Protein: Conserved hypothetical periplasmic protein
Organism: Zobellia galactanivorans
Amino acid sequence: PIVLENGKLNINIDSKTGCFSVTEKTSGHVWKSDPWENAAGLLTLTDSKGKKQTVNISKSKKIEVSKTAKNTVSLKFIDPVFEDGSVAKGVSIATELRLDPNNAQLDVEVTEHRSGNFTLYDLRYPARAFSLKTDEDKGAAVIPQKQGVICPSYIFPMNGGRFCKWDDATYNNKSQGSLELFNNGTGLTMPWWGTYNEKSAVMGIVDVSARPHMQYNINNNGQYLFNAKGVMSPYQRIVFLDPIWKLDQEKGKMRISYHFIPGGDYVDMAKVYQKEAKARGHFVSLQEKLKRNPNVNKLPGAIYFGIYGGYPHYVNMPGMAFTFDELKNIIKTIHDDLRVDKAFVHAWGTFSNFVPHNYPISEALGGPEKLKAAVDLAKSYGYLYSSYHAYSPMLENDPNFTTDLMQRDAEGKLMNTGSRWARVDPKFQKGLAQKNIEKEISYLGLEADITDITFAAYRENGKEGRIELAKYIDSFNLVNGTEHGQEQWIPYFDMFEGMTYLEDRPLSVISHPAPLFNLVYHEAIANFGKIQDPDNEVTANGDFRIKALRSMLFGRGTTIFFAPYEFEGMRPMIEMARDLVSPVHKETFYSELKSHEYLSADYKVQRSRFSSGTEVIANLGPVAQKIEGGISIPGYGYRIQMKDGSLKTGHFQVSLHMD
Amino acid sequence: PIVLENGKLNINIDSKTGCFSVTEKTSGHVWKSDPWENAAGLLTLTDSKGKKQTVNISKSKKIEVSKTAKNTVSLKFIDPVFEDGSVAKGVSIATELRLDPNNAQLDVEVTEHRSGNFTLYDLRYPARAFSLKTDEDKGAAVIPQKQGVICPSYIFPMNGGRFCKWDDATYNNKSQGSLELFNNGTGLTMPWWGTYNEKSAVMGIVDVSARPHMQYNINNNGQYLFNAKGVMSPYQRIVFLDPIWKLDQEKGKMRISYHFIPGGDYVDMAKVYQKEAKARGHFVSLQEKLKRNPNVNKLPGAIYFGIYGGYPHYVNMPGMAFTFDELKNIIKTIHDDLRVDKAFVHAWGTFSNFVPHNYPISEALGGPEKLKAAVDLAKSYGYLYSSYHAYSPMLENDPNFTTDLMQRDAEGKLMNTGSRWARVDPKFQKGLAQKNIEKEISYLGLEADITDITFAAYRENGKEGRIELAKYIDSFNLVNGTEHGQEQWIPYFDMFEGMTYLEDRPLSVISHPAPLFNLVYHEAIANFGKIQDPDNEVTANGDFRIKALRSMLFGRGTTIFFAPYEFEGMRPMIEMARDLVSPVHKETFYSELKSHEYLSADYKVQRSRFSSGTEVIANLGPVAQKIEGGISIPGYGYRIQMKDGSLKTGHFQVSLHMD
Ligand SMILES: *[C@@H]1O[C@@H]2CO[C@@H]([C@H]2O)[C@H]1F
Ligand SMILES: *[C@@H]1O[C@@H]2CO[C@@H]([C@H]2O)[C@H]1F
Ligand SMILES: [Cl-]
Ligand SMILES: [Cl-]
Ligand SMILES: [Cl-]
Ligand SMILES: [Cl-]
Ligand code: NA
Ligand code: NA
């Protein structure tokens, strides 16, 4: 066995297989290689019949493992062998393991692959590494799926209905699969993931140039590998996360950097990535942004109101569109009646054309002067105001629809024919924004702007055009927001609408929300709830009780998103948000979310600590529970130490009034 | 233009294509054939080279349409043509349309199919029939997906967040796909579906011998047919539901019976099917069941309590398992403290072996005498009691696990390796129940029984063993319940736990729950909320406010399902269910749900009328809304006319208690 070692880690590399283990010397924890099949890697490729097959590369005809430098081991896997015994002759995979000379860090890189007459697809490498043993290790997989989740490596008490779904999911295909980097759907928002138990944590940071996918396996024993064979899995229930190198697509450096943290958990992982986030240039702080624009300080303690008038979906839809006088009256009621001190008013439906033609201000709704009156009222309160804007859509129901603004692929076929809100090629989008955005800023005296869709993901295709549009918008020095966001867009915006949770998502029944993105970026970007899943709607992610408490724990702002006819029903939630969430949001807005903890066995009682000196404890479940020192946190209740030392305690109650 | 006609309907058949239109003569509404491609059917088959392809059978080499009887048109589609222009020589499809001589009914049947040297797969027939034109027809598709949904054929006001998800789904793949019959997952619980507008309704009833799937298209313009070609759809947005006949699987009669109802909607469709359900033998009324077993009358007004002790998933799990003294005390508190007058107490975790060995009563939890003391207390209150029972599982973590009782397929391979709760071949399950159920009934003096899993679906494989188990359990004449249920099992049970809604499901963002199943079967089977989505959990299907109101509208009972440590947090919801839902459930339990209506344009305010003389109006949304007479229904509010003349009015309120 070839050995790489420094003061902190011992890497054992098996000469016959290329599998490796990592001993964290301070704790004695041994991170094992593939516990199921001793596969260093899992390679998907075509066979001589051209059928796709997945092979264990440790069963290749030739394995070369040699220490090519003091802290480098080079591996070569030559001529993999298929299940039927034939050989992918001429296929080879070359990899390196590079141990940092001083730090508990191991770089793993796929340096070369050769296809011969075969075609190569996925490479899980390292395969099924750094795993946790279900119900022995007491820890979790750590996955930055949108705001982030952890998946515990053991069964624990919880509501019986949740418990049945949870446990059942670890025995079927709900607990295995893959996710992608940097989308606004089911995927990850940071290029890292990890596992930890009570002794030890490990995380891998993907090279900035690469886009692997991430395979997950959450307490599954691999039965999915045997169902078509009709046999019971002989493997043990484990937790693992693997990089999937897309060999047919990947043009970057296929490197992942593993960091080993003694006694660490998801918080320590987040803080390690935060240093890398700064090095990558993503981290531009809200204090810096405030220095550049004092109007940033109208965000702390602001409720984000989206007044949804059926636009961009429809122009002047009966029963949904607001007039401009109606808009003004809603703004006035929020301020005078509901005593909301700070607000971001976002009015969806101000233009009489479909996006991406964000103009003119609609005559039917009252015309420019009446909109200006509504905006001038909001400004006189110190509120932020934006209309709905988007430069990416090309809508079937728009009379100005044209495929001329769309993008075509290498075969000349239109792209995103099935995705109406993102059809305009990004290379056109600055020109579309240029048609009226400066005239609207000038006429309405705008201080803020929110733009939909274009910055919700960070994909390679079209990236140059999105950056161009980001720089143009950012040049006006408005307080500016965008839908969902990604870490790459943080330098160009002050707030993200979203960066929370999908309602229906892989892992939902076997994970707990964790503020992983905000543990990294809360000082650099303000986020608010997603308009599709706002705090006034009851969804898979909770009711107002749950969402308000999670808001304070995770450091996000309140989102009230409503059609105009609902407004009267919004009042109690605006009031409770005003009284409970807004002062905590205000106090913690610029600070670092230093730590988050789960304080109860069922993960429902949590504690967050902000560098403002603010501490938030909240109980997101129905039953009072005790924490350290016998303090009891009521169901749907909270206990908050503010910066000045005052203690706030309370809870939400659901009542039935009977006439 | 061959014609079938009677006094109520006019069927116009095209001789060149086989497409037909139906004129419903009372309203004059015309149901058109395929508005997109003039396809009578869509046939999926392999080509010369073995690739699956889907063809328009109206483009076949030869099409014969002849009136072959007074009210029968026979159609023949010979030699379908592929898209490249090659021919499926020797493939044919024969169909018939048979108009009832007197009634507004049209039978449609695939009588013969010949495959030659190709392989036939799916046949949509009739294809894209009985469609609604989006935003022109004001109506809905009607789909008995579990309890049932309707899918409006037009955009309407709703919460802004729901609105974006709704409208967006009609432009992507969320609005197209297929469902299956008689499963406990995403599928249909009754073999019918339909469409209606403001003039007329049509529904199709599938032959009892057949198992087609159901294709849906909910306001989609068919862009999904063109995404791979990378062009824009030229078709218009429509709603349709099609039979999918699985030609490679189907052994029954491929017949569907269309019924045409002037001025009808989903209520009228349900009542049409209710006649066929009685004819099929499914409909055994709760009044007949009460005549056989007076204890059935302990169900009306009962809250269904599941005390989830971590079983069947684990035996005596720390932090989840209850002792029998603890169980007794929970029962005592529910009665003496919470004043719950009627209840079904369901204790999950009473045996020291894993299911399917439902014995012995656990010594570790206290032994048989202490369990008897709990059951005796329950019975002294007039409560029903059951342990958790299941005879279908074969669990990996059971020390007695064996593949001996699992089913194998023709190749000797284990079946359901992926589905741990349904592994025991149903031909063994009566014998497994016989091992101890009679001893338990005898020793505890049981009056009730609930069984998990076995009767949640109605599949062909294993049906006879399931029927044998059902007859055995039914022979004890206990009040008996089962998980989920299906219409075929109604003769054997008094209550179904479930038959409501999955949390995550196809159509969820573009449908409204409608009590289709209970509109048919409320007089015949009692249902309660599903244990995984109980009324005390906040999920995609609502919080307690929404679930309690929907309970009274749809005619189901309350389900409070909790781990023991949660019990104190359940108190407020038990009290609210006690005061609001229980008296309405009690009054309406045996009655027919005569009618259901949506009274607001956002479908949140609804009215149900029961044949007990009870009318339930409730508002499942946040804002007060007015109905006829200018009566206002508060947000999360209700207006209930009871049989005794009293009018119950009230609403739920969320409040913030800041200490
Ligand atoms: C029946 O089936 C399985 C076992 O118990 C639960 C579910 O997890 C019940 F729903
Ligand atoms: C941005 O994208 C589309 C359009 O508006 C919504 C969504 O439907 C917003 F989220
Ligand atoms: Cl875009
Ligand atoms: Cl959040
Ligand atoms: Cl079964
Ligand atoms: Cl329901
Ligand atoms: Na800005
Ligand atoms: Na019975």
In short: Chain A touches chain B through 101 residues (CB under 8 Å). The two ends of chain A are 79 Å apart (CA to CA). Chain A has eleven helices and 36 strands.
